[PDB]
Nucleic acid binder design. Structure first.
Length: 95
RNA sequence: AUUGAAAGUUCAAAGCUUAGAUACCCUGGAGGGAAACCAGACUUAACAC
């Protein structure tokens, strides 16, 4: 099963508060980055249970169909303008 | 003009007394919340050429 042993946010949450931004992801470069349409791209450190074989990243980045159906599993439009604690933003970005 | 005439089978009298529709008796036995079903379909737009 998929186990996310840890993900080192608390830096993405910083640059998110009081704003309404779309948090895009990208997994090429072998390190998970978290693009923000509010013009910042924080590289995310994480440890998972699945080892993406470095062939799968390329198979998804090259196949224009895969990278197209990947738009739906890639982003959230987080709205922190109103009351927005850090913990629930953590769970949002974690999921 | 008769072995006749005359003569109320009448009177008094409670179908009453005692007496538990009760005794025994499992709504139980048998019986699959199952049958069918794709987490899938597809790229498009823009300008450059």
């Amino acid at each position: 099963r998929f186990e996310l042993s840890y993900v080192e946010l608390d830096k993405v949450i910083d640059c998110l508060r009081n704003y309404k931004r779309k948090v895009s992801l990208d997994f090429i470069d072998n390190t998970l980055i978290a693009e923000i349409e509010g013009s910042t791209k924080i590289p995310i450190s994480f440890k998972s249970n699945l080892d993406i074989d470095k062939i799968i990243k390329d198979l998804v980045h090259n196949n224009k169909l895969l990278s197209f159906e990947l738009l739906g599993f890639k982003s959230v439009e987080i709205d922190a303008t109103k009351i927005s604690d850090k913990k629930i933003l953590k769970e949002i970005l974690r999921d």
